[PDB]
Design a protein around this nucleic acid. Structure first.
Ligand SMILES: [Mg+2]
Ligand SMILES: [Mg+2]
Ligand SMILES: [Mg+2]
Ligand SMILES: [Mg+2]
Ligand SMILES: [Mg+2]
Ligand SMILES: [Mg+2]
Ligand SMILES: [Mg+2]
Ligand SMILES: [Mg+2]
Ligand SMILES: [Mg+2]
Ligand SMILES: [Mg+2]
Ligand SMILES: [Mg+2]
Ligand SMILES: [Mg+2]
Ligand SMILES: [Mg+2]
Ligand SMILES: [Mg+2]
Ligand SMILES: [Mg+2]
Ligand SMILES: [Mg+2]
Ligand SMILES: [Mg+2]
Ligand SMILES: [Mg+2]
Ligand SMILES: [Mg+2]
Ligand SMILES: [Mg+2]
Ligand SMILES: [Mg+2]
Lengths: 177, 146, 214, 23, 37
RNA sequence: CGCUGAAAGCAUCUAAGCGGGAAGCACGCUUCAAGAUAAGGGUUCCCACAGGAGUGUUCCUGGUAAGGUCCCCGAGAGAUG
RNA sequence: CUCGAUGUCGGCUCGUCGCAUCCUGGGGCUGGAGUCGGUCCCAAGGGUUGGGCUGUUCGCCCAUUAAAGCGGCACGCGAGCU
RNA sequence: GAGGGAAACAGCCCAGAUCAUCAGCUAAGGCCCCUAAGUGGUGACUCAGUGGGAAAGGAUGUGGAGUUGCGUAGACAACCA
């Protein structure tokens, strides 16, 4: 495991508690929880880093080895930096507005606007009535939130109208030629 | 003349099996063997010489493969379109006593005496049972080598 | 799981009124008289929460020692009918509490439960809506007949639940989403818009509508 | 048909050494 | 989606995967989406 | 239909894991239901009778308590029960 | 198998099962702009009309309907009828 | 033409019942429980409940064994012109 054997660059001022199989990360942004899976050992590498090991050269061990390595990296860098994944809206009459830092309201050509909530771990940042993003301190739940937001009105192939990923390659077709 | 037990001659003991992480089939074979007194030298098919079997942690019974969803238990009321199906996982979560009792009953002779002896199998999904007055003794499912 | 208000009453008959829109409404009149809380069922003792109410006048010589003891524990005078109401807020009722018809207001939707009128042994044509055979055109002594009752060799049996003649009526019936037209609390009278099961003088349980309305 | 195919399949059991009456 | 016993690659961008016990073909062209059933 | 994601440095809804999704499934609504012999539960009521043979006191008869049934008047019930 | 009898066509009556789905429900692809469709994937919960002709089944037709499904049950059903 | 096996099951398998036996060894077939005897030992494979039905054909399922092309003169995938 090239990534797995690659250790974790711990940033400054972050408390990383390795309670055996439990991970606690504390910094100026939030707290995160995950029980490190049993067949992986974790050490502090003279208290300044993380060494993540695999008991055996069987396949499942390397699977979980890489997963845990970049999981710890993801979690610490989330407590220190935060993320972003961006979406954009196209089409006449389509707008996105904010009902707070935790909410979104869409006019996607429906009969009524759609109200979108978020977990406490995900916060929205709508910068334009035609551009917005989803952030948090996680990286799968951000993906699923953005996917559901796109699913609310996915791009039609006839004019491109709808919600799309910021650089999505919407495969279009010409209709009434 | 070969020995034959007399009514209440053979004493019937109480046992408690902890079904935590025990395969359903192993537990059912062991319980059926104990209920009918097949481990006793005084065994008789026509006289109930078996013991009382208490099974705790019946909700934690182990199932291999995809049995928890794909292994189905069926019932029929007799009237057309009256078939119900459930899975063994849902049975264990919902009615663990019924699941264990079905598994055990399928493994006993189809008798009047077997219907009487199945009443000695007390099944509980939790780790506790109400039969402390009978003092069930722990039973470990074990194999004899060779 | 659900919170239900309830009262016990007697079916007195039916009348009619005109509402504010000058529409004729049929109303059942219910003597929804005084009900006392005669027992309270709790999850600690009975395993479920409910209120056993008592309704009706009874001759003291017709009450027995067990019934007298039950009512004495409740602290009430003996009642003819004891009916349990399954409500999640049975903990708010006290033993001997007086429950009157004013539990319901002038526009509440209610469920009315009663034992329906009996018809004796009815045939398939009356109790199950069967069509018999024609009155003429050769029909031979089978005008009100059930027809076929099964197939053939496969299966050599009549299936369970086949609709046949038998005794019909005298069964629990609930009519849902009936609008309370009016409540006269001092004389314990309730006007409910519609028809409710049972003959006149039969015991009725009036409860909150489970499905609210339509 | 199911019936005939099961009749012809019964011959593959262990104690019938590849043969059965009526195939 | 085309549900056939015989699914193959039509595009050069078709890719044959096994998913949840079924052989499927996924292309970026939605026409070439195939399932084995 | 997806999210994250390797095996397979990419890719992949899947292999670990997570999620949307039908008048269908199980509930929700109504009704029956402890012969559910696993014969359940709560509350309330009456209570230590008499005589024989007895054989761990057993068991069998007899008069009762609480409670019922027969009988009579009926119907909101009903072929008869 | 049944000839020391296993009554048979159609209809009426009463149903019950399958899904190879006619309607309603969900979806993928379209030579899917919209309204409409085509096609094949799920799906059997409920529903699935009344007449003219003919012994008919079938079929043609009339007026509808969301639709007027295809089959099994001794081509279900005569100790149920015609 | 009984007995044992094949779930049941004339024709298949083993085996040809003189009677008694509350002795033993075996055949076919079996040994987790029904159901007598092994939840037998050792080594592989399968994850489909395949085992415990089926075709043309389709398929990066999985484990193994050969032939051959490219390759630290740096091979294939990814990232910069
Ligand atoms: Mg008529
Ligand atoms: Mg007549
Ligand atoms: Mg007949
Ligand atoms: Mg054929
Ligand atoms: Mg991907
Ligand atoms: Mg029953
Ligand atoms: Mg005869
Ligand atoms: Mg289908
Ligand atoms: Mg149906
Ligand atoms: Mg016929
Ligand atoms: Mg011979
Ligand atoms: Mg023979
Ligand atoms: Mg046999
Ligand atoms: Mg001989
Ligand atoms: Mg031997
Ligand atoms: Mg042998
Ligand atoms: Mg044995
Ligand atoms: Mg073993
Ligand atoms: Mg073994
Ligand atoms: Mg199979
Ligand atoms: Mg095959």
């Amino acid at each position: 495991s090239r990534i797995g054997r690659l250790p974790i660059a711990v940033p400054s001022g972050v408390e990383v508690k390795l309670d055996g199989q439990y991970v606690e990360v504390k910094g100026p942004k939030g707290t995160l929880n995950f029980t490190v899976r049993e067949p992986i050992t974790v050490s502090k590498n003279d208290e300044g880093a993380i060494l993540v090991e695999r008991p055996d050269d069987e396949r499942e061990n390397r699977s979980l080895h890489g997963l845990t390595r970049t999981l710890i990296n993801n979690m610490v860098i989330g407590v220190t930096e935060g993320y972003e994944k961006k979406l954009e809206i196209q089409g006449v009459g389509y707008r996105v507005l904010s009902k707070g830092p935790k909410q979104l309201e869409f006019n996607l050509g429906f009969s009524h606007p759609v109200i979108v909530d978020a977990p406490e771990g995900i916060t929205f940042a709508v910068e334009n009535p035609t551009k917005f993003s989803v952030q948090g301190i996680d990286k799968q739940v951000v993906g699923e939130t953005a996917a559901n937001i796109r699913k609310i009105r996915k791009p039609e192939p006839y004019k491109g109208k709808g919600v799309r990923y910021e650089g999505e390659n919407v495969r279009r077709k010409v209709g009434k030629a | 003349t070969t020995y034959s037990p007399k009514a209440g001659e053979v004493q019937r003991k109480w046992y408690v099996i902890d079904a935590e992480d025990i395969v359903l089939g192993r537990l059912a074979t062991t319980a059926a063997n104990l209920l009918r007194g097949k481990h006793k030298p005084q065994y008789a098919p026509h006289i109930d010489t078996g013991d009382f079997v208490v099974v705790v942690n019946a909700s934690k019974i182990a199932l291999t493969g995809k049995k928890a969803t794909d292994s189905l238990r069926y019932d029929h009321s007799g009237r057309p379109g009256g078939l119900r199906v459930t899975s063994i996982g849902e049975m264990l979560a919902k009615n663990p006593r019924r699941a264990v009792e079905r598994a055990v009953w399928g493994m006993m002779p189809k008798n009047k005496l077997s219907r009487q002896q199945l009443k000695k199998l007390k099944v509980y999904g939790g780790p506790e049972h109400p039969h402390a007055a009978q003092n069930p003794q722990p039973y470990e499912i074990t194999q004899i080598a060779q | 799981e659900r919170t239900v208000k309830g009262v016990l009453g007697t079916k007195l008959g039916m009348t009619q009124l005109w509402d504010e829109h000058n529409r004729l409404v049929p109303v059942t009149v219910i003597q929804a008289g005084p009900c006392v809380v005669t027992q309270v069922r709790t999850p600690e003792t009975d395993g479920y929460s409910a209120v056993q109410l008592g309704y009706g006048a009874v001759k003291a010589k017709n009450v027995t020692k067990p019934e007298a003891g039950h009512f004495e524990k409740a602290g009430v005078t003996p009642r003819r009918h004891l009916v349990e109401l399954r409500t999640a807020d049975a903990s708010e009722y006290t033993l001997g509490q007086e429950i009157a018809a004013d539990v319901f207001s002038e526009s509440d939707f209610v469920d009315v439960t009663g034992t329906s009128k009996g018809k004796g042994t009815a045939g398939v044509m009356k109790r199950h809506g069967f069509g018999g055979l024609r009155a003429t055109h050769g029909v031979h002594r089978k005008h009100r007949s059930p027809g076929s009752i099964g197939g053939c060799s496969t299966p050599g049996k009549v299936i369970k639940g086949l609709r046949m003649a038998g005794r019909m009526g005298v069964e629990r019936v609930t009519v849902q989403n009936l609008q309370v037209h009016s409540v006269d609390a001092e004389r314990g009278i309730m006007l409910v818009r519609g028809a409710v099961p049972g003959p006149k003088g039969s015991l009725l349980v009036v409860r909150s509508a489970a499905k609210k309305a339509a | 048909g199911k019936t005939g195919r099961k009749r012809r399949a019964r011959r593959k059991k262990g104690a019938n050494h590849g043969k059965r009456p009526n195939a | 989606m085309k549900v056939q016993p015989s699914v193959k690659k039509i595009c050069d961008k078709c890719k044959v995967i096994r998913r949840h016990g079924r052989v499927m073909v996924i292309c970026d062209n939605p026409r070439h989406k195939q399932r084995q059933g």
